[PDB]
């Protein structure tokens with residue numbers, strides 16, 4: 392029911408160290424708290440403390456995030472629930488690193504084995520493991536799209552033609568969802584098939600350089616895995632359930648004064664910030680029990696509508712930087728992520 396919200400603080404990066412930035416973030420997984428020194432060079436004691444469902448410090452390894460957050464989600468999907476996990480936070484704090492991850496040097500590991508692997512590569516591997524172990528008759532279908540400047544583009548369409556803006560419509564046979572017309576939904580039979588498709592897909596997800604992040608996501612990435620399951624019980628009863636998992640890598644809050652974003656990059660930041668703002672208003676509207684929730688004001692919240700206050704089991708991974716340089720941005724991330732904890736969802740099997 393209640394949306395699960397966890398926070399992950401990444402390690403200081405080079406630029407922060409070279410700028411002699413100091414640490415203003417303390418994570419306490421035990422108490423499940425994140426405290427932020429809000430004082431300034433003046434006050435070095437005053438702290439702002441938030442309590443979440445789970446808190447991951449700078450030493451948190453990919454596998455830790457997965458075992459703690461994803462594994463339980465994965466089983467729910469197998470149960471026939473609709474689930475969503477999305478990474479949220481300031482540009483450069485670890486959303487993409489967390490959702491997709493990277494690859495260790497010299498092929499010392501296969502994708503699934505890699506300690507740098509993110510949530511998505513691990514989940515595609517695990518999905519088949521659990522399904523084969525389950526015994527059900529199953530079919531797996533995947534899709535990947537990015538929301539770029541309020542337009543939708545399929546990232547898995549293999550065609551050579553330039554990608555067209557996909558149109559979105561409410562699902563006729565389901566008032567709790569949308570339909571992306573023309574979106575490719577590729578049937579996959581094992582991790583190898585999925586991995587080939589995934590790396591090519593994630594590779595073309597619009598990424599560009601900004602002073603804050605040389606590898607900044609210029610769009611919100613939405614990777615969906617739909618699983619059709621059909622089994623026959625010992626009672627000769629045939630049950631058909633459908634599970635779905637949305638792994639979302641959002642673009643992140645960006646102060647163009649700091650990112651130095653110009654024209655095209657600035658245009659992207661404008662859309663990114665506006666869409667995230669709309670996400671914040673949706674969250675706030677749900678926590679305040681407001682008569683209206685502004686889902687329709689952005690393609691992001693339309694896609695995430697059922698995930699936010701609907702019949703989807705949702706988990707949020709708020710990513711933050713430990714540097715004193717990002718006090719306002721960090722507080723903003725923690726504040727909205729904290730509010731999200733109070734949103735009540737009504738998950739139900741399909």
Ligand SMILES: Nc1ncnc2c1ncn2[C@@H]1O[C@H](COP(=O)(O)OP(=O)(O)NP(=O)(O)O)[C@@H](O)[C@H]1O
Nearest residue numbers: 401481482483484485486487488604607608642643
């Ligand atoms: N937990 C971590 N451990 C090591 N490196 C990290 C970690 N988190 C983030 N990074 C690195 O910082 C750079 C990533 O920024 P990420 O790609 O993490 O930014 P982002 O949140 O996707 N930025 P943005 O797309 O603008 O919202 C990556 O090359 C990562 O390797």
Ligand SMILES: [Mg+2]
Nearest residue numbers: 486487607608
């Ligand atoms: Mg990114």
